[PDB]
Each structure stands twice: as structure tokens, then as C-alpha cells.
Write the C-alpha cells for this entry.
Amino acid sequence: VHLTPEEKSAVTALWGKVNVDEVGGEALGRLLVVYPWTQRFFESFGDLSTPDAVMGNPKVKAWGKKVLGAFSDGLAHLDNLKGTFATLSELHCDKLHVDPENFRLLGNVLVCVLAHHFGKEFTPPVQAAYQKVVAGVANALAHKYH
Amino acid sequence: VHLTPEEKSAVTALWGKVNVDEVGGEALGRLLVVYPWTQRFFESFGDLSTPDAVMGNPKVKAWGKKVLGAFSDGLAHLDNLKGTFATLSELHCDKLHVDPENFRLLGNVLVCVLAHHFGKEFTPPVQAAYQKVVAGVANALAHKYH
Amino acid sequence: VLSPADKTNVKAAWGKVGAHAGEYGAEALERMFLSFPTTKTYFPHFDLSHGSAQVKGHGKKVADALTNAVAHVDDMPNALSALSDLHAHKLRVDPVNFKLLSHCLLVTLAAHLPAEFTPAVHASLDKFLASVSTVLTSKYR
Amino acid sequence: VLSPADKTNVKAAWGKVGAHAGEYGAEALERMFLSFPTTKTYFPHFDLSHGSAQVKGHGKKVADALTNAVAHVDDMPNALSALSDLHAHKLRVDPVNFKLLSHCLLVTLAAHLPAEFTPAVHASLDKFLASVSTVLTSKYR
Ligand code: HEM
Ligand code: HEM
Ligand code: HEM
Ligand code: HEM
């Protein structure tokens, strides 16, 4: 993954404005709502019976915050996503056996969430830089499969 | 991609029996027949109007032979598919803009062709070793996208 | 399979687009070209730069096809049949690409309709665009 | 969309399976488990080793569902509706996985029916399994 300086600038500027207590939970919740087979991995997370139940579920919010934390770490190490995501790759691939297509899906849901929250500020070139980032993270998280 | 010694053995033993003048053309032709949008990239290849026309098309056979040649090279360098496929990656990604999903599809068509030709000898563990190989090649060929 | 709730949700969100329909269609295409550059090669006769009259005009066509699908959501295979033939037979559009445009359409809607883009409506819109895509990729031969 | 030729091709190839139907279904599952190990986690109550009575029994069920689809190929959404609910609502099978089993079914057919697995019939079978998969993944909510 290769962001140009203008794309790194676009990415880091927007990210500074992100609420790290909320956005990750919003993405994970939306993943569970939009792509319901993903709920297969979150049996122990409690009530996921309605969209409101999912979005309000404190465990969804907590783990969403952990996901966003890993994205934040990825942003700090764009040139070594593979090492950054090594243990998470062992977890999601070797332990959980999550199909790696879902890493791409969560990346895109995160993109939709950023668009929703930032509106016109989430311009087409800003989106393009973020797509490079979420593809980079998905690919790194899938390394144990490759 | 990590083949165990038993899987390398399974792979190389079968490959020694493959007709390198025919199998690649059979795979490429079948790709064009089974997944017809792929014909988009082969406009200059002439008559592709029927399955017989595709399978008998001398250019399909010739380029199929080049594809198989690249697989043969990949088999010889399983520990460096990325370097092995670097220039082909520039070609298929940067020049041709082929979506990398099609590399996975051609890999699987090749698998079906090997099953067709070898029958019961293409056992489920032999198939599993070949899936590791065609995933490895697809991933390497897509490196310029990653 | 679109539920009654999905149909209501899509019609409602689409309702809020109004005069902006073609504009948002053009924006989705621009987002797709910038984010997923492989898709550019389908349009060698278009200049794809920002503000392109050709992309603006095409955006309106894409929007119109989507509103056709909304308006005839229970009979989409029939409504989009001609478009399906075009994209498969003539244009040979790789099926992966429909997922890319569908995503960029969702992103465009989220960037313009914050009140409407709830998680439920997000799911409804995604199912709808997947259904449209399924029809548009149903005619490979 | 399955053409008349596709329907004929699938019925004909499937015709040659005969008593072997369940066996080939079990073989396809075994190929899927070995080649795509993520799919194993859907069957924690099965022993998946070679010669497994549970995999053999399940193979017969999978084969039966496929023959149901062949026999009612023009009404597949209805014929497979119950199976669709099961795989989406109860089992939560990831849609990517249908492509994996479909591929392993093609590989099994190619390994057993060399005269029938022509390029045309290969295409027909692939379209048919994709149609079956489309139905089996149509009920996520
Ligand atoms: C960009 C993609 C993803 C990222 C960055 C990510 C990140 C994380 C992080 C940081 C954790 C906490 C790990 C820990 O406790 O040390 C986690 C746990 C988990 N993730 Fe993800 N995740 C991603 C995608 C997914 C998807 C798509 C699924 C399933 C559909 C999934 C399933 C899980 C589960 C089940 C856990 C709990 C693991 C356990 O504690 O046993 N993840 N993930
Ligand atoms: C495993 C996947 C593939 C392998 C190993 C492969 C290998 C090759 C090789 C060795 C050549 C000859 C390059 C040369 O002349 O130096 C070639 C050319 C070409 N390939 Fe592939 N290929 C693969 C997949 C595909 C797919 C899926 C498509 C399109 C659907 C495609 C489109 C082309 C085209 C259009 C050329 C001609 C390039 C030119 O001469 O301008 N390839 N490929
Ligand atoms: C929601 C999905 C899509 C919709 C609703 C849609 C709609 C349309 C419409 C309404 C037209 C004009 C048809 C006519 O003039 O009769 C068109 C043309 C075209 N579409 Fe799409 N499309 C979709 C997806 C795609 C994708 C993913 C691609 C390629 C990446 C694509 C490539 C093209 C091309 C190359 C043309 C011809 C434009 C020209 O040469 O003037 N479409 N599409
Ligand atoms: C062509 C595609 C498929 C067909 C025709 C098919 C068919 C079937 C049938 C007929 C049953 C038994 C249903 C019953 O008892 O009422 C079943 C059960 C089941 N299927 Fe599939 N299936 C397909 C794809 C898949 C895939 C891709 C997966 C997961 C990788 C899967 C996982 C399961 C599981 C976990 C069960 C429950 C078995 C048990 O717990 O006893 N299926 N399927």
C-alpha cells in the first residue's frame, strides 16, 4: 500500500477528528446489521436481535473501540502493516477462521461511517486514500492465509 | 504459501505427467468459455464465438501455453512467488488492469482441468496442495495491487 | 430477497435525493474511478476528471436506472433486462465491479443524507444494490 | 439465467451420476474441508476424517438438494426456500463459502465424468451451482 504525501495528509487530517470511543463501535455494529452472517462470531456478545440492540450493545461498542484502535496503529505504521497486524492475523485466521472477505467488508463499512460522519469533507480523493488504507489493513490481517 | 513435503511431493509428481503443450490452453479456453467477461481482454485473439471456436483457437492455445509456463516457474520457486511473478504482475495489474479475482478463477479452472485429466489420481489431498499453489500464484500476480 | 421494510427504506432514502439524483450518480462514478482505478478502462472515450460533462451525463443515466429499479422493485429482472444484456453481452463488465460501484453509491448517499443513512437503511440500500447487481450480472453466456 | 441448453447439459451430466450421487456429494465436502479449512468450523459435531459416516450421510443430503434443484430448475427459489432459510438464519453460512463448495462439486464431477465434463457442460454446471448459491444466500436479514 502506497499513499502519496497528499493522501497521507488527507488521511491523518480526517483521523484526528474521529471520535475513537464511537466510530469503531458504529462500524462493527453496522457490519453485524448489514452482513448478518458475521454475527456468527459474536455469540457471546448478547442481544443482537434488532439493529437498535446491536448498535446499543455495550460489547459491540467495546470491541468496536478495539478494532478502531488497530486501525489507528495501522495508520502509524503504513510501511509495516504486516508486522503491525501479525498477532491479529493469527487470531482472526488461525484461531477464529473468519473468511478474509469480511475484513474487506468491515473496511468498507468503516468507509461508509466516515462518509456519514464527515459528509462533504469526505471527498472522493479522501475516500480514495482511505480505500488504500482499509485494503492495506485487510490484506495484512489476512497474511496468515497467504 | 507453505506446502508440506507430502504436498510438494503430490504437486511435483502430478506435474511431471502434465502435457505442457495442451493443459494451459485447455485452462485458458475454459476460462473464456465459463467466465465470458474475460474475453474482454482477448479482442485481438480472433474467433471466440462458440466453445469449439475458443478451444480450437490457436492463439488461445499459444497463450495458454505461456500461462502454464508461468505456473511451471512458480512451482520451481514456491518460496519466492513474488519475485517470480513481478513482471507479470506489472503486466496484468498496471498495464491490463485485470481484476485480481480473475487470477483466482483461472487458478480454479486449472484445478478443474487437472481433475478432468487425472481423474481419481487427483485425490482430495492432491487437490488441496494444488489449491495452495494456485492461491499462491494468484496472490503473487496481484502484488502490484497490494 | 427484499423485505417490505427494505422496499420502504430504499424508496424513502431515494426520495430525499430529489433534483440531486444525477449529481449523486456522477459523484458515485467519480468515487469509483478514483478509489478503484481498474474501472477506468471501461470508459476510454470519457474524460474522467472532476467536472467532466461526460461523467455528469452518465451519472444521470445511472441514477435513472436505479430509480427504474426502485419503482419496479418487485419486477427488477424484467425492468433491468435490457441494461443486463448491455453490461454482460456488449460491455463485458466484470462482475466484481458491480460491488465497487454499489459501495461508492452507498458512500455517496451516506455523505449526502446523514439523517436517512441509519444502520437499518444502510442494510436495506446494500441489499437493494446487491439485487440490482445480481440482475445486471445475470446474463453472461 | 440458465438457458435451455444449460438445463439440458446439467440434467445430462447429473444423469450419469446415478447411484454415485451421495458418494460424490461426500467427496465434494471432503475436498472442501481439505482445500479450504475455514469451512470445517461449521461442523464441530462431525468427524471430518476420510471415511467418516457423518460426512458420507451429509453428502447424500447435499446431493439430494442438488437433484431437487435440477428437477425444479425453473422454480429454484421456491424449491430451495427452506434450505435457504436454514443456511442463512440458523447456520449463518458466510456467502463466500458457497463458491468454495461449488468449485469442489465441479472438481468432483470432472474427476468422475471425463466424457461429460466438456467446456460447454463445465460452463452450464458452473452457472447452475452459482444459481443454487444465489438462492441459498438470498435470505440474510
Ligand atoms: C479490519 C478488520 C478487523 C480488525 C482490525 C479487527 C481487530 C480486532 C481486535 C483489536 C480485537 C481484540 C483482540 C484482543 O482482545 O487482543 C478483535 C477481536 C475479535 N475479532 Fe476482530 N477485527 C477485524 C475484523 C473482524 C471480523 C470481520 C470478524 C468477524 C466477522 C472479527 C471477529 C473477532 C472476534 C470474534 C474477536 C474476539 C476474539 C476473542 O477474544 O476470542 N474481527 N478484533
Ligand atoms: C494465474 C493467472 C495468469 C497467469 C500466470 C498469466 C500468465 C501470462 C503470461 C506468461 C503471459 C505472456 C506475457 C508475455 O508475453 O511476456 C500473459 C499475457 C496476457 N495475459 Fe495472462 N496470465 C494469467 C491470468 C490472466 C487473466 C485472468 C487475464 C484476463 C482475464 C489475462 C490477460 C492476459 C492478456 C490480455 C495477455 C497478453 C498481454 C500482451 O501481450 O499485451 N491473464 N499472461
Ligand atoms: C448499479 C450498477 C450499474 C448501473 C445501474 C448502470 C447503469 C448504466 C446505464 C443506465 C447505462 C447507459 C445504458 C444505455 O445507454 O442504454 C450504462 C452504460 C455503461 N455502463 Fe453501467 N451501470 C452499472 C454498473 C456498471 C459498472 C460496475 C461498470 C464498469 C465498471 C459499468 C460500465 C458501463 C459502461 C462502460 C457503459 C457504456 C457507456 C458508454 O460507452 O457510453 N456499469 N450503465
Ligand atoms: C450447493 C451448496 C449447498 C447445498 C446444496 C447444501 C445442502 C445442505 C442440506 C441438504 C443440508 C441438510 C438440511 C436439513 O437437515 O434440513 C445442509 C445442512 C448444513 N449445511 Fe449445507 N449446503 C450447501 C452449502 C453449504 C456450505 C457452503 C456450508 C458451510 C461451509 C454449509 C453448511 C451446512 C451446515 C453446517 C449444515 C448443518 C449440518 C448439521 O448440523 O447436521 N452448507 N446443507
